[PDB]
């Protein structure tokens, strides 16, 4: 057997994982046979928490559950209707665990847009028809917090399109206080934001197509404005009018267009708000304190921490999340070194002169994320080990002495495991390790004093037994030296790769700002089929613009998208040719989204290196894409700023060079993110230039092209295109 296309599509080979939910410092929940069990890590015993019969009172309509912090109630989510990437609506009913009954009084309404328990206890806040509502007790009536909500105009406690996708990476815009006195929330106003409109054809029985419309700021368009409010939840009554307190954003940021980009409660009387100018080389973290007597939140200038960049933008995508100490006096966050390397800096509540902080890590490698912060130690993930930017390991550092820097995951299994993710318990007493590659993913439980593996949660032995008759590809993670700098690649090689042979090459590209497509993770995907069955080498290259390797590399494409990142992808191909095992007459490239852009730019470059390629839902020019993402890298499309490079970096300008290649263009018609327009303009420019190419639209599909049948169809279509191109 080879790993066929049918195997990839039908999903015959399941890469298992293990998702648990740490409820306490020693206990986590897990799904058995649709049953939810509680596992205590101090012991080795399990306890039934929620039987599958309870979910079956709603049939198969259940989509998720959410247990209250105090474990007295369970939110049961059903009738899930997807919206954008993170947003959806659902129905909810609360289940009393103690009494084993549903609360049928003052129930959560239909089409709820977001809902969450408080941090402690069991208070609820939810959004419905763009307004926020609060329940102190599951059986109690809701307190209407806001009355300005309006479909696609005013959002209370939920993000609008661009804030969901590009800033928060979630639909939620509300944040409960630690002990639940205060609920904070953002409010967005889309008035003036121009609308993207497209057709949705729906099922065959719909006689007239309906026009979908979304407020969606394209590059240099009017953006949504924002406000931030904090309501007192313990003082809510039907007899008194509910009045939220407004926090004004830092003066240095409200001089023009700006964003809210991070919120974190420090204490019950303290909250950190990060803001960001529309020109995204300037951010401000304001620590704001509650005044007991005058009912206002104060944001003193002394508690404003500035971030900036002279070479690019702030943070990888957004300015980094602060992690505060339990007293709320100091906080840690990831920030660029003097050498451009992203590392954990330590700050105080007050800013020091010239905004200085203490770096507790350093070197030619980056901290990826901060996972836990206890009294004594800091847990983080980095790519330090073996100087591999696409490796991930758990580290443990002491706040007193920065030299005491353990690696907890480096050695465990160095052949099978170079790419770890972690899930630490409520106060870091235990932790789940998630080995994601390059071997078969491995999930294990650990105690934190001694790094003692308690048990194996998932070893993927079932997948092991099923792969034993299949010709397995291998993954090669390595680098090449260009101008004294090393750039990593990865190659999914055909089974028993014979370097003496010449193989066809497929560049699989994304190559967006801060992207990493060369890593030590394990994937059972389309590329494996191409190697296993078609004997095609699938390669990815992290050139300039790629992340996790310092700001010198990442900011190289500042104001210049469609430049060095596309050129570097061509050069990688040339380097693969010099390695002697690539058939130069059969080199191709494909990508999705930014990958689609880079693919099209590569093919239109006239390099002569690539026979063919496939662009899936490509960006075609940056004026068509949303403000927040685009302007972060390209600035505004004006004569005063970067309009010349906006006009110069389009796929359409390169139409004539596509005569040298075979091109497949694919786009979902209901793509809310990278709009069909973008491919519509590419095809119109190609047609105008007399260039042949091949095309495929997917009716009603969005950016994921993720409906099962469409998903199978696109990969079949693309597969056939490579067969034609290579055979």
């Amino acid at each position, epitope marked *: 057997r080879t790993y066929t296309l049918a195997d990839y599509l039908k999903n015959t080979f399941r890469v298992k994982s293990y998702s648990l939910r740490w409820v306490s410092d020693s206990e986590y929940l897990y799904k058995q046979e*649709n049953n939810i069990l509680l596992f205590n890590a101090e012991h080795g015993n399990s306890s039934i928490f929620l*039987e599958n019969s309870t979910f*079956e009172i709603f049939g*198969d309509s259940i989509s998720d559950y959410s247990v209250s912090p105090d474990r007295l109630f369970v939110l049961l989510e059903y009738n899930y209707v997807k919206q954008w990437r993170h947003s959806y609506t659902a129905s909810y009913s609360i289940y009393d665990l103690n009494k084993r009954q549903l609360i049928t009084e003052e129930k959560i309404p239909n089409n709820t847009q977001w809902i969450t328990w408080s941090q402690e206890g069991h208070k609820l806040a939810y959004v419905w028809k763009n307004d926020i509502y609060v329940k102190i007790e599951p059986h109690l009536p809701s307190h209407r917090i806001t009355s300005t909500g309006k479909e696609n105009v005013i959002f209370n406690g939920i993000n609008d399109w661009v804030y969901e996708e590009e800033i928060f990476g979630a639909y939620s815009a509300l944040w409960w206080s630690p002990n639940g006195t205060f609920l904070a929330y953002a409010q967005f106003n889309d008035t003036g934001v121009p609308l993207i409109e497209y057709s949705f054809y729906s099922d065959e029985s719909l006689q007239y197509p309906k026009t979908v419309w979304i407020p969606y700021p394209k590059a240099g368009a009017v953006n949504p404005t924002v406000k931030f409010f904090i309501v007192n939840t313990d003082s809510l009554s039907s007899t008194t009018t509910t009045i939220p307190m407004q926090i004004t954003a830092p003066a240095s940021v409200t001089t023009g267009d700006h964003y809210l980009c991070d919120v974190a409660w420090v204490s019950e009387d303290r909250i950190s708000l990060q803001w960001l100018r529309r020109i995204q080389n300037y951010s401000v973290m304001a620590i704001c304190d509650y005044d007991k007597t005058t009912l206002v939140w104060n944001c003193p200038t002394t508690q404003e921490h500035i971030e900036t960049s002279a070479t690019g933008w702030c943070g990888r995508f957004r300015p980094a999340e602060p992690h505060f100490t339990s007293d709320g006096s100091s906080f840690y966050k990831i920030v660029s070194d003097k050498d451009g390397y992203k590392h954990i800096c330590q700050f105080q509540k007050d800013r020091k002169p010239e905004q200085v902080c203490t770096f507790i890590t350093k070197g030619a490698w980056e901290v990826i994320s901060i996972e836990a912060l206890t009294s004594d130690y800091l847990y983080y993930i980095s790519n330090e080990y073996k100087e591999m930017p696409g490796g991930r390991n758990l580290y443990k550092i002491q706040l007193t002495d920065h030299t005491n820097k353990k690696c907890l995951s480096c050695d465990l299994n160095p052949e099978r495991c170079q790419y770890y993710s972690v899930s630490l318990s409520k106060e870091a007493k235990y932790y789940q390790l998630g080995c994601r590659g390059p071997g078969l993913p491995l999930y294990t439980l650990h105690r934190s004093t001694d790094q003692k593996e308690l048990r194996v949660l998932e070893d993927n032995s079932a997948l092991d037994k099923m792969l034993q008759d299949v010709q397995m590809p291998s993954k090669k993670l390595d680098f090449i030296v260009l101008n004294e700098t090393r750039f990593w690649y990865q190659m999914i090689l055909p089974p028993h790769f014979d370097k003496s042979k010449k193989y066809p090459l497929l560049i699989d590209v994304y190559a967006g700002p801060c992207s990493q497509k060369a890593d030590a993770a394990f994937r059972l995907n389309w590329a494996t089929y191409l190697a296993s069955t078609e004997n095609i080498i699938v390669a990815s290259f992290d050139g300039r613009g790629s992340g996790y390797q310092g700001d010198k590399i990442m900011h190289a494409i500042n104001k210049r998208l469609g430049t060095l990142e596309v050129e570097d992808q061509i050069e990688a191909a040339r380097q693969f040719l010099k390695m002697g095992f690539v058939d130069s007459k059969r080199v191709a490239i494909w990508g999705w989204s930014y990958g689609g852009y880079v693919t099209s730019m590569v093919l239109g470059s006239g390099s002569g290196v690539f026979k063919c390629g496939i662009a899936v839902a490509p960006v075609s020019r940056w004026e068509y894409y949303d403000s927040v993402y685009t302007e972060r890298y390209m600035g505004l499309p004006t004569p005063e700023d970067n309009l010349d490079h906006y006009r110069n970096s389009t796929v359409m300008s390169r139409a004539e060079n596509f005569k040298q290649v075979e091109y497949l263009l694919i786009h979902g018609t209901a793509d809310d993110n990278v709009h069909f327009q973008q491919s519509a303009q590419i095809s119109k420019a190609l047609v105008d230039a007399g260039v042949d190419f091949q095309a495929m639209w997917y009716t009603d599909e969005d950016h994921g092209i993720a409906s099962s049948t469409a998903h199978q169809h696109i990969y079949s279509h693309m597969s056939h295109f490579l067969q034609q191109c290579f055979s």
Partner: antibody
Amino acid sequence: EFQLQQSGPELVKPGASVKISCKASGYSFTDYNINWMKQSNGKSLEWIGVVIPKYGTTNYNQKFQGKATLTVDQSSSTAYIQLNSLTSEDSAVYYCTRFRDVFFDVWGTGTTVTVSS
Amino acid sequence: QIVLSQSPAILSASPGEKVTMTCRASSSVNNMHWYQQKPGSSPKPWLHGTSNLASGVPVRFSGSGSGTSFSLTISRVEAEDAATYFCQQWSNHPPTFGGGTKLEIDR
């Protein structure tokens, strides 16, 4: 190995109420959910609600929130449906059905209930 | 409450023939179920999980479909098949029934 027998037919005046039984035997009664349906003569079927025998947890169709009241005896392996404050439009057949974590895999004889003066 | 529609009301096909059946929803559904009921008798479980055959169910039957149009196919129709088939949905609460496909036999 899966028997669902319900009590016999029923006549009642408008305003009154009635309880109908559903005896279960052969299997471990405490493991699967009892769901109740309604079928007016000629019309389509309608779901009323469900109970989990083990803990007595119920879930009603909003349409019958006030109308039906479901209960369970686990020593007798019997489930009941109390239909309260009846009228002419409550006249129909009523089925107790099992749920095997997927669908209704056992159906009882069906109790014809008539409401008239 | 997703409203299901049974296509058609009464399907009259002879013994040994092709007989296909289809349930049509107002909104998408992940799995479809099917139940056989004869006049003066209770419904019976036939096909669960779109297409799987219940315990003791004949093998001349098969199911299929996805989204807003599922289906069920009876192969060589026998005399005993004469009944009424109902489609059940419960991927969306509350569960619903499609108002009957009456299997008539043409002889």
